[PDB]
Amino acid sequence: EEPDREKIKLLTQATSEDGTSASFQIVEEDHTLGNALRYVIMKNPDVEFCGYSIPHPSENLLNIRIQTYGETTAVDALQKGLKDLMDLCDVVESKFTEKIKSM
Amino acid sequence: PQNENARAEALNLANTDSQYLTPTSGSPVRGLIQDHISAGVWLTSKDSFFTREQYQQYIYGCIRPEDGHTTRSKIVTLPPTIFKPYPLWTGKQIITTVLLNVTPPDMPGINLISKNKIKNEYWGKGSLENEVLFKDGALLCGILDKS
Amino acid sequence: NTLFDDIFQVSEVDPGRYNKVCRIEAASTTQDQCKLTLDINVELFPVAAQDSLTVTIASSLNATRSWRPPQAGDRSLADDYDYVMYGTAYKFEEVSKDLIAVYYSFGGLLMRLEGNYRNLNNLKQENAYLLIRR
Amino acid sequence: KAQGRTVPIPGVKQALEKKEGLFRKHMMGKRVNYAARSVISPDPNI
Numbered sequence: 001e002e003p004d005r006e007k008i009k010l011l012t013q014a015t016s017e018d019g020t021s022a023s024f025q026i027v028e029e030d031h032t033l034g035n036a037l038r039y040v041i042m043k044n045p046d047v048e049f050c051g052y053s054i055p056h057p058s059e060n061l062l063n064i065r066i067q068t069y070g071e072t073t074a075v076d077a078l079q080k081g082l083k084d085l086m087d088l089c090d091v092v093e094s095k096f097t098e099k100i101k102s103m
Numbered sequence: 104p105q106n107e108n109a110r111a112e113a114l115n116l117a118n119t120d121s122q123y124l125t126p127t128s129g130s131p132v133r134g135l136i137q138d139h140i141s142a143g144v145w146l147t148s149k150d151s152f153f154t155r156e157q158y159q160q161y162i163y164g165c166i167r168p169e170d171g172h173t174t175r176s177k178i179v180t181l182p183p184t185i186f187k188p189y190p191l192w193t194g195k196q197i198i199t200t201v202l203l204n205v206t207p208p209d210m211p212g213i214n215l216i217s218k219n220k221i222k223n224e225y226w227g228k229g230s231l232e233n234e235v236l237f238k239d240g241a242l243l244c245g246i247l248d249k250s
Numbered sequence: 251n252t253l254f255d256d257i258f259q260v261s262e263v264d265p266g267r268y269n270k271v272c273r274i275e276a277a278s279t280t281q282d283q284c285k286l287t288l289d290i291n292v293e294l295f296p297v298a299a300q301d302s303l304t305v306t307i308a309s310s311l312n313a314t315r316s317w318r319p320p321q322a323g324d325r326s327l328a329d330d331y332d333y334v335m336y337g338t339a340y341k342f343e344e345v346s347k348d349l350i351a352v353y354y355s356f357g358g359l360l361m362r363l364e365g366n367y368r369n370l371n372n373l374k375q376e377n378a379y380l381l382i383r384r
Numbered sequence: 385k386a387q388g389r390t391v392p393i394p395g396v397k398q399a400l401e402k403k404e405g406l407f408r409k410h411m412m413g414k415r416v417n418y419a420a421r422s423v424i425s426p427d428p429n430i
Contacts, residue, residue: 011169013169013171014167014168014169014176016176016177021177023167023168023169025169038160039156042155042156042159045319045321049159049162049163049178049180050159050163051159051160051161051162051163051164052160052163052164053163053164053167055167055170055429056429056430057429063167063169065163065167065168065178067177067178069318104418105418138428139428147358149268149271149289149358149359150268150269150270150271152270152291152293155319182316182317182336183317183336184335184336184337184356184357184358184359185291185294185333185334185335185356186328186334186335186336186379187328187331187332187333187334187381188294188295188332188333189294190319191291191294192357193356193357193358193359194358195357195358196357199357225267226266226267226268227264227265227266227267227268227273228264228266228273229264229266229273229287230266230273231360232358236340236355238338238340239376241338242358243338243340243355243357243358244355244358244360
């Protein structure tokens with residue numbers, strides 16, 4: 001087994017010395033995950049600033065900036081965002097299956 | 104160009120940024136042309152309000168610290184213009200925040216009293232929306248036109 | 251602490267081709283020479299003609315680093331009023347003998363208060379909170 | 385400066401002044417290496 005290193009990348013040129021602020025770059029992603037992920041990350045009470053930006057349409061890149069308050073790194077805020085979006089999808093999938101039976 | 108002396112020249116003498124003003128009259132030949140002008144009249148309008156989520160998105164959408172757009176290595180944000188009931192940011196505040204992150208921190212904010220192409224009469228009774236006002240790098244009055 | 255406090259009577263509510271903002275023309279119930287011209291987000295806090303508004307100017311809320319969204323157990327001066335705005339004073343004008351008119355901007359949403367005694371308390375501060383009740 | 389033969393062959397003076405001239409067409413102006421040409425398309429993301 002080998003993990004892919006080209007997908008998520010931490011832009012060290014923008015990362016806070018430690019540890020709250022960072023800019024992440026994801027390949028083969030756009031508005032689909034982008035707007036959904038920044039929405040979930042913004043629900044975190046520790047996230048100070050969050051937004052997504054696509055550098056250019058021709059290049060397959062997605063940038064997401066997470067600036068938090070203390071006691072939480074930007075990496076943790078991203079990991080919480082992904083973990084919550086997965087659970088959010090489970091809720092959608094569970095409610096849809098139930099209403100199909102309810103018909 | 105195939106050498107560093109020719110590179111330095113194309114980056115410091117003949118480069119686009121050093122050609123903002125034409126030597127014919129010393130007037131600008133660089134600026135935004137159509138959608139951007141119509142977008143600005145709407146974005147900087149009094150009626151344009153934005154939530155924390157919306158406001159921060161518009162900031163990072165145009166300013167990316169990783170692409171070296173910032174001067175503070177952290178995106179600084181103004182407090183909302185409306186605190187209670189709901190926290191809301193004005194359209195003009197986005198223009199203040201963009202300048203606050205692109206202009207040097209060591210220097211004070213821009214102070215300018217300019218005018219608009221759109222007369223006050225169009226914006227209703229007692230509006231001062233024609234007077235473009237910048238006090239310490241903050242858009243406090245007037246929309247932004249082709250002007 | 252507070253810098254100004256008074257109850258005003260609304261004489262005009264004009265949208266002026268705006269769907270969410272309105273220019274309010276008011277006069278003080280206590281002082282005769284006192285007048286007000288203020289832009290408010292009518293979508294959140296609606297104002298009607300012939301209304302009593304308790305307009306109050308404060309320096310802060312009873313050293314802060316930055317604004318944070320509300321979190322359980324936070325007390326503020328804003329908890330006493332309905333609609334609160336944060337803005338700056340940009341112009342100080344004098345109208346004839348003793349009368350002085352101040353100019354405030356809450357991010358495009360302009361305010362013009364006319365009085366006389368407030369010359370000491372009201373100063374051109376890059377931080378001025380405007381709180382309104384009823 | 386030569387007699388008519390029943391367009392004549394160009395002389396060395398004609399070679400230096402063919403159209404705009406050797407000086408204008410091949411000294412003051414020249415075709416260059418490391419260069420490209422294409423139709424321009426608008427882009428607000430760059």
